[PDB]
CSV table of C-alpha atoms in Angstrom, one decimal:
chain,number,residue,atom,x,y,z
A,11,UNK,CA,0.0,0.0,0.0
A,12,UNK,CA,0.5,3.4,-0.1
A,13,UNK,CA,-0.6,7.2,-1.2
A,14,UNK,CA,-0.3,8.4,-4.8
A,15,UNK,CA,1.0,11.5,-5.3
A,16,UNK,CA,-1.0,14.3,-7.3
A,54,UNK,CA,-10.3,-2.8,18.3
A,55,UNK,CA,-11.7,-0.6,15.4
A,56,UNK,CA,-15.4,-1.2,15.6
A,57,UNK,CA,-15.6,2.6,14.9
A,58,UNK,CA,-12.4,3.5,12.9
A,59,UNK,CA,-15.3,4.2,9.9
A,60,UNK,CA,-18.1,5.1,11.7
A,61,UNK,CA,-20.4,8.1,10.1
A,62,UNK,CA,-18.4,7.5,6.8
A,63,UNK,CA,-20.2,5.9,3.7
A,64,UNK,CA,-18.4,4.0,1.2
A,65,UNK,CA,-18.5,2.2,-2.1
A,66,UNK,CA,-17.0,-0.5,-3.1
A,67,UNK,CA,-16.7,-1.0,-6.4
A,68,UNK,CA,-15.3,-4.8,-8.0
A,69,UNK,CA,-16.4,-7.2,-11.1
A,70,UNK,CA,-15.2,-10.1,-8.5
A,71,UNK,CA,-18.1,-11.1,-6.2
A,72,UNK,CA,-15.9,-12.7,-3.3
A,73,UNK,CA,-13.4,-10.0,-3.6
A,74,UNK,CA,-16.3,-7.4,-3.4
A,75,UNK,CA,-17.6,-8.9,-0.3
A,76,UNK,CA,-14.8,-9.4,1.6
A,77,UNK,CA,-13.8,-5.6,1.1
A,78,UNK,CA,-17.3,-4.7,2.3
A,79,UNK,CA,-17.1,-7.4,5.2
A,80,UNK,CA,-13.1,-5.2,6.0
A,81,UNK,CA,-15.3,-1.7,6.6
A,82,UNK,CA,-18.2,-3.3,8.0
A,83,UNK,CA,-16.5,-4.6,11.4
A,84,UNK,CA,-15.0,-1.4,11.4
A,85,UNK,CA,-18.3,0.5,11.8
A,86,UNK,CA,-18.7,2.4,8.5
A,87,UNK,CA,-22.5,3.6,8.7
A,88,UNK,CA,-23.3,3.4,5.1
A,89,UNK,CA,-21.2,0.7,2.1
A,90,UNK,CA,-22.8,0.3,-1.2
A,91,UNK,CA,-21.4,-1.8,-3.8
A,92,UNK,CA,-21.1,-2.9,-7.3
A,93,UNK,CA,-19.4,-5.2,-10.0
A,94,UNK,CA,-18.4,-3.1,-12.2
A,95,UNK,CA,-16.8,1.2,-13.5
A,96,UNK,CA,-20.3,1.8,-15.2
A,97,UNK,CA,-22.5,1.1,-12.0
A,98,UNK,CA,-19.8,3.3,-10.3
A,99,UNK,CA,-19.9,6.0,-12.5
A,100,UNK,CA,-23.8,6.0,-12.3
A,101,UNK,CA,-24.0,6.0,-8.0
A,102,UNK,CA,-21.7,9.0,-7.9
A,103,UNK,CA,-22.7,10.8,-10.9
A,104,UNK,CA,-26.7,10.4,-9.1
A,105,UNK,CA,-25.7,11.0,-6.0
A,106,UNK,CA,-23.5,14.2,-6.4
A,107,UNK,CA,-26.6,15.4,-8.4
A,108,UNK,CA,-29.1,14.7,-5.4
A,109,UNK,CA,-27.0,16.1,-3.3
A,110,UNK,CA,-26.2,19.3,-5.1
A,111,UNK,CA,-30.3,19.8,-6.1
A,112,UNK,CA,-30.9,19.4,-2.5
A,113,UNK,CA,-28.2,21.5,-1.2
A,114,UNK,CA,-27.1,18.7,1.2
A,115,UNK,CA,-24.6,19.6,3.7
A,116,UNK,CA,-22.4,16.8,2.9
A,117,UNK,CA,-22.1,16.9,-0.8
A,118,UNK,CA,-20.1,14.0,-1.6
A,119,UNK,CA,-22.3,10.7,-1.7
A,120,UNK,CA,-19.4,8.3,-0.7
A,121,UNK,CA,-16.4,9.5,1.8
A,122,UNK,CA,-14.4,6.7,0.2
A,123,UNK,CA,-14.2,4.7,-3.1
A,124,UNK,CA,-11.9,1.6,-3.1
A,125,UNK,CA,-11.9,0.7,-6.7
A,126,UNK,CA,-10.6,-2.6,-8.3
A,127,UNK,CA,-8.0,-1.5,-10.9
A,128,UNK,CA,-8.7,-4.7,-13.0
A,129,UNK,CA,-12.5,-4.9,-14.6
A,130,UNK,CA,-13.2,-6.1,-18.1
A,131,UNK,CA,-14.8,-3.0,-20.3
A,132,UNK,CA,-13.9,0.2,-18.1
A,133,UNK,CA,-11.3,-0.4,-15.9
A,134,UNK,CA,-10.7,1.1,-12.1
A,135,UNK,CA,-8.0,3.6,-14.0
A,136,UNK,CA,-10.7,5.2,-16.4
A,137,UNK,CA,-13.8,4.5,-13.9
A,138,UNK,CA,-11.2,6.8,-11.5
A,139,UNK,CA,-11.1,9.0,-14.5
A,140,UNK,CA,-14.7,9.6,-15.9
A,141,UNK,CA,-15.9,10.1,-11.7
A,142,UNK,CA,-12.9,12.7,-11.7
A,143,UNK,CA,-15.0,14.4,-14.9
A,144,UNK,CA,-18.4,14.2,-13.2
A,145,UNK,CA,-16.6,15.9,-10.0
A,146,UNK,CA,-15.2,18.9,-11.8
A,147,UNK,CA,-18.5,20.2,-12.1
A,148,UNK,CA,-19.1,20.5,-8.7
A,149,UNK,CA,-15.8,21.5,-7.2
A,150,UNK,CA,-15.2,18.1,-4.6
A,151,UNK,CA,-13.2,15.7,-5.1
A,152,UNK,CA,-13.9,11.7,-3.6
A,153,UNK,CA,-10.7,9.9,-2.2
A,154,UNK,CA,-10.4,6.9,-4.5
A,155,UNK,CA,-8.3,4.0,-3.0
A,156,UNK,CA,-7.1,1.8,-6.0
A,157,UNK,CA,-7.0,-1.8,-5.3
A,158,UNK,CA,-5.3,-4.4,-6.7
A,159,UNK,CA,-4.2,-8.4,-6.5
A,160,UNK,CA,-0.9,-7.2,-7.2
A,161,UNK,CA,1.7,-4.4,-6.7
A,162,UNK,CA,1.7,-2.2,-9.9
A,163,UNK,CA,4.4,-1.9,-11.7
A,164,UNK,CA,5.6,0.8,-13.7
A,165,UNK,CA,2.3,1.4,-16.7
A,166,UNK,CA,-0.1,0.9,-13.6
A,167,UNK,CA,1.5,3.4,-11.5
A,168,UNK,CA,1.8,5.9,-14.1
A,169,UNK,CA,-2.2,5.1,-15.0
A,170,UNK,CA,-2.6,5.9,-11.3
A,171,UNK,CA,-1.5,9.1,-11.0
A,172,UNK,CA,-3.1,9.9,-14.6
A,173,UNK,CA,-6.1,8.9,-13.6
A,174,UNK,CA,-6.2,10.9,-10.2
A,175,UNK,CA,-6.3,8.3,-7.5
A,176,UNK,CA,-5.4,8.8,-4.0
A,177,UNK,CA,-3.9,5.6,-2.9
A,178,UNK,CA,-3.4,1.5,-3.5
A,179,UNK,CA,-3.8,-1.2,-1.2
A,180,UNK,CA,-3.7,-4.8,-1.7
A,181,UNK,CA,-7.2,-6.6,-2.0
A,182,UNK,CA,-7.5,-8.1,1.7
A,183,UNK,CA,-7.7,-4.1,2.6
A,184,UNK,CA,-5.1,-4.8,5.0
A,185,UNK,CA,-3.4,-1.8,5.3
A,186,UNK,CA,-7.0,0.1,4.9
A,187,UNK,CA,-6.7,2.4,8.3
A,188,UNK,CA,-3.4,3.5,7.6
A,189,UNK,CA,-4.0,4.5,3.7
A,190,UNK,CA,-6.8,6.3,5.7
A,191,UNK,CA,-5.5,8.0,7.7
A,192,UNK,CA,-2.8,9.2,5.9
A,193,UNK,CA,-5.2,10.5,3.4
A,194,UNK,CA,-7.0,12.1,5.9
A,195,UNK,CA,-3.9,14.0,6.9
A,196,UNK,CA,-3.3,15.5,4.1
């Protein structure tokens, strides 16, 4: 793991996350990871298109309705490797949607393996935050260190 450059039964708790991966067992284990640590609201979905429509909705709603929190995830862990739009351009295309409303999401890339060097480069194109391995185990450190900066 770590940040890309431009008990904790409550470590998460208030925050709402998506987690977004074509792998069904991958997905749920991810979602099992922030669960037990108290993360109010997860959502999920297989694969960049479903992503793309949650947070392209949701920052709508919210903006319409002048919610106070206008971002409708805290956190997206994205899986780098999906067949048709990949995490890299899903990460991309939310980017897009965001510029119109002046937020930006922290988007936590997560991959099987380490990347080498066309997926790190693809990382920092594509505007993500961080990289973890796909048991999440380094989760609340990549968070916090996001959170600190």
């Amino acid at each position: 793991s770590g940040l890309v450059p431009r008990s904790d039964d409550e470590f998460l708790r208030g925050k709402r996350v998506l987690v977004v991966d074509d792998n069904f067992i991958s997905r749920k284990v991810a979602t099992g990871k922030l669960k037990k640590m108290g993360v109010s609201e997860v959502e999920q979905c297989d694969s960049g298109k479903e992503a793309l429509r949650l947070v392209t909705e949701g920052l709508t709603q919210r903006e319409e309705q002048g919610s106070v929190d206008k971002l409708p995830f805290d956190y997206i862990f994205m899986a780098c490797q999906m067949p048709e739009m990949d995490g890299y351009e899903a990460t991309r295309e939310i980017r897009k949607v965001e510029k119109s409303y002046g937020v930006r999401t922290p988007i936590i890339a997560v991959s099987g393996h380490d990347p080498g060097s066309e997926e790190a480069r693809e990382t920092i194109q594509a505007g993500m935050d961080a990289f973890l391995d796909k048991s999440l185990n380094q989760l609340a450190n990549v968070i916090r260190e996001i959170e600190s900066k």
